[PDB]
Design a protein around this ligand. Structure first.
Ligand SMILES: *[C@@H]1O[C@H](CO[C@@H]2O[C@@H](C)[C@@H](O)[C@@H](O)[C@@H]2O)[C@@H](O[C@@H]2O[C@H](CO)[C@@H](O[C@@H]3O[C@H](CO[C@H]4O[C@H](CO)[C@@H](O)[C@H](O)[C@@H]4O)[C@@H](O)[C@H](O[C@H]4O[C@H](CO)[C@@H](O)[C@H](O)[C@@H]4O)[C@@H]3O)[C@H](O)[C@H]2NC(C)=O)[C@H](O)[C@H]1NC(C)=O
Ligand SMILES: *[C@@H]1O[C@H](CO)[C@@H](O)[C@H](O)[C@H]1NC(C)=O
Ligand SMILES: *[C@@H]1O[C@H](CO)[C@@H](O)[C@H](O)[C@H]1NC(C)=O
Lengths: 209, 210, 229
């Protein structure tokens, strides 16, 4: 059993956002709202239909009528970009019930360029006859990035793996890994990871080291 | 400093029995009931059950008779126990305090993978360049999630980035960075502090220059 | 350098917080609560605590209660039935087992005149019946129930019942009061004030609010006059 909730709700900076929460005779029982971010515990943002804990920004407000609760995020900030679950009480069975959940995305955010950092394989790792090159991409918006690898003008595809971007508050972050062998690493002139965000191609060099 | 913190095994084989423990600090269980709530990767929040202030218990209809919640007030400790572990018992498990009609305080949560796969410890490799300098830590080849990453036990309270995990060949890999001003890292020794709850591994890997 | 300030009506209850970070480790050796009218003038103990035994004293003997779990380094004070004489500065001093001391900012208690106590509603309108204790510390109120009883009633009626350990989706309001009674206070902020929506001639009577901080109950009473226009 889950309370009906829209999957996604967008919003420009400062814009108003409204998340609905529907349930049978929902308006004969308190409804509460929680916020959850990337790999974080939920946080109570609204409780008892229409109330707010101190520590929650003023621009949050809730209502409950016509068996449909609504979490209002007036004047939306980038730090409001999260997952929101409403919550309540089933009085048929005796249980507490959550909503399906809504992902609130915050648009109108600016285009920040990524800061790249290419690392060589540790000596400690080469003993293993394995060499991992770590090219980390940091502080970029939006969350679109294609990482490419090279070695003496020859692109390396197989043996590569790139992570999915994830948010830091004002930006997205990711990293790509190139996995050579001991000899593969030490037999090639200059390695490059090519990071692509927008019409931009940041490249960072690496030689014996 | 009212806190709930959960604890237990991170990895289990099927048909085993899960048993989590939630330590409620700064208060007494004698006058507050504690919830257990889980969240499967894809899906949302699912209420499993409650142990009320009075020790009474109610559960989720679907979770019928292979869930078990008890406690020990002397330790301020509320236990969960799950039976007949299948797949998508794999979830984040949270314990939360019950205030009136809502969940005022929540635990940090605990990730619990249910897989056939054996536990694998990470290999921790340092990353150094080869004004401000950015250092790094490569926590490679572990299973399952999660994997902590502190710098100097948390002394480094800034610039610390921990990047998402990649999944290849049933093993996870994670990298973490830290930026510090020129004439600090050489002068003063930075340290990486990786921890893998699962395998019970902890690793303090000082980032030497290279 | 700046005293938290607390204004309460004569007869009401105040809770005055005194917590070092709540841990599962009793580090509180002693807890002392002192009262003073001004400075330049003597202080008197409201209450002092040591070795799991508290001594309420003075005029505060009957009215002062150590509400915080001292085994959790919470030595908060609850002063009931506040008088005008109680107007002054309240100071919490906790001696820690590590022998350091913690003095909390003295709190100015300003006592206001007595609440109306006599409410006059007009039939077919909404009124509010307020009931709340005031504290520097939130979420201390563990239970609130409003009881209705017309001077005729050799009986009591639940207007609204709300508790920290509810196995319901909402407050309990029974009978007549269903659909009309509604909570205007934030119980989490120790505020049990309620609202009565569509008042009928028969609503007339005495409403009694029992507001609890643990076992300790504070009680208010409000006479409701209904009028036909
Ligand atoms: C006796 O016990 C005292 C209480 O100890 C705490 O509470 C008890 C119940 C237990 O739970 C116990 O585990 C707790 O530790 C203890 O007091 C504590 O002392 C520490 C220092 O060792 C304080 O931490 C520092 O706080 C100051 C800020 O002071 C202001 O704020 C605090 C509250 O936030 C107030 O207490 C003060 O009045 C001030 O208003 C910071 O300046 C400092 O940070 C700076 O230094 C740290 C290094 O520690 C750096 O990392 C930072 O960058 C800063 O440069 C600390 O954070 C702690 O606040 C304090 N808690 C209290 C008083 O409740 C006392 O030390 C014990 N006595 C002995 C002899 O051990
Ligand atoms: C302290 O007194 C309290 C009563 O509030 C009691 O719960 C506790 O067990 C007592 N501690 C002792 C006897 O050590
Ligand atoms: C004080 O306690 C006495 C015990 O006899 C009781 O009669 C009275 O109601 C109490 N009053 C207050 C204000 O606590």
């Amino acid at each position: 059993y889950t309370l009906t909730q829209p999957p996604l709700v967008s919003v420009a900076l400062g814009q108003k956002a409204t998340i609905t929460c529907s349930g049978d005779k929902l308006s004969d029982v308190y409804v509460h709202w929680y916020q959850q971010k990337a790999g974080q515990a939920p946080v109570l943002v609204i409780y008892e239909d229409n109330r707010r804990p101190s520590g929650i920004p003023d621009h949050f407000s809730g209502s409950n009528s016509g068996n449909m609760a609504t979490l209002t995020i007036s004047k939306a900030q980038a730090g409001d970009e999260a997952d929101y679950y409403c919550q309540s009480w089933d009085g048929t069975n005796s249980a507490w019930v959550f909503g399906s959940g809504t992902k609130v995305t915050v648009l109108g955010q600016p285009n920040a360029a990524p800061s790249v950092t290419l690392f060589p394989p540790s000596s400690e790792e080469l003993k293993t006859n394995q060499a991992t090159l770590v090219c980390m991409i940091n502080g970029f918006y939006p969350a679109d990035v294609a990482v490419t690898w090279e070695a003496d003008g020859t692109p390396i595809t197989q043996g590569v793996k790139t992570t999915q971007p994830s948010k830091s508050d004002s930006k997205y972050m990711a990293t790509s890994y190139l996995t050579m062998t001991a000899d593969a690493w030490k037999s090639r002139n200059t390695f490059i990871c090519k990071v692509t965000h927008g019409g931009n191609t940041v490249e960072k060099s690496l030689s014996p080291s | 400093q009212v806190q709930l913190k959960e604890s237990g095994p991170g990895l289990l084989q099927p048909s085993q029995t899960l048993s989590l423990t939630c330590t409620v600090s700064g208060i007494s269980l004698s006058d507050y009931g504690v919830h257990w709530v889980r969240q499967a990767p894809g899906k949302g929040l699912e209420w499993m059950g409650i142990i009320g202030h009075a020790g009474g218990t109610d559960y989720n209809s679907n979770l019928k008779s292979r869930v078990s919640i008890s406690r020990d007030t002397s330790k301020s400790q509320v236990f969960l126990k799950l039976n007949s572990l299948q797949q998508e018992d794999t979830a984040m498990y949270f314990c939360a305090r019950h205030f009136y009609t809502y969940f005022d305080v929540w635990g940090q949560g605990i990730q619990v993978t249910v897989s056939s796969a054996t536990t694998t410890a990470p290999s921790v490799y340092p990353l150094a360049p080869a004004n401000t300098v950015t250092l790094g830590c490569l926590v490679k080849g572990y299973f399952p999630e999660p994997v902590t990453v502190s710098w100097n036990s948390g002394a480094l309270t800034s610039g610390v980035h921990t990047f998402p995990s990649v999944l290849h060949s049933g093993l996870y890999s994670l990298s973490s960075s830290v930026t510090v001003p020129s004439s600090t890292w050489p002068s003063q020794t930075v340290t990486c502090n990786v921890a893998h709850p699962a395998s019970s591994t902890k690793v303090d890997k000082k980032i030497v220059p290279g | 350098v700046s005293s938290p300030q607390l204004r309460v009506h004569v007869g009401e209850s105040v809770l005055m917080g005194c917590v070092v970070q709540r841990t599962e480790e009793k580090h509180v050796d002693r807890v002392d609560w002192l009262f003073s009218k001004d400075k330049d003038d003597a202080s008197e103990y409201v209450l002092f605590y040591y070795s799991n035994l508290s001594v309420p004293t003075g005029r505060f003997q009957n009215r002062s209660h150590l509400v915080g779990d001292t085994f959790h380094n919470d030595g908060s004070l609850l002063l009931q039935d506040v008088q005008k004489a109680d107007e002054g500065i309240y100071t919490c001093e906790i001696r820690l087992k590590n022998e350091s001391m913690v003095m909390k900012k003295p709190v100015e208690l300003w006592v206001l005149p007595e609440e109306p106590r006599d409410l006059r509603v007009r039939v077919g309108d909404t009124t509010q019946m307020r009931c709340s204790i005031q504290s520097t510390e939130e979420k201390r109120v563990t239970k609130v129930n409003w009881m209705f009883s017309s001077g005729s009633h050799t009986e009591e009626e639940t207007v609204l019942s709300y508790d920290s350990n509810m196995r319901s989706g909402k407050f309990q309001s029974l009978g007549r009061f269903r659909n009309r009674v509604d909570l205007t206070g934030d119980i989490s902020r120790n505020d049990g004030s309620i609202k009565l929506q569509t008042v009928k001639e028969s609503d007339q009577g005495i409403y009694t609010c029992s507001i609890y901080v643990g076992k300790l109950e504070s009680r208010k009473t409000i006479v409701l006059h209904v009028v036909q226009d």
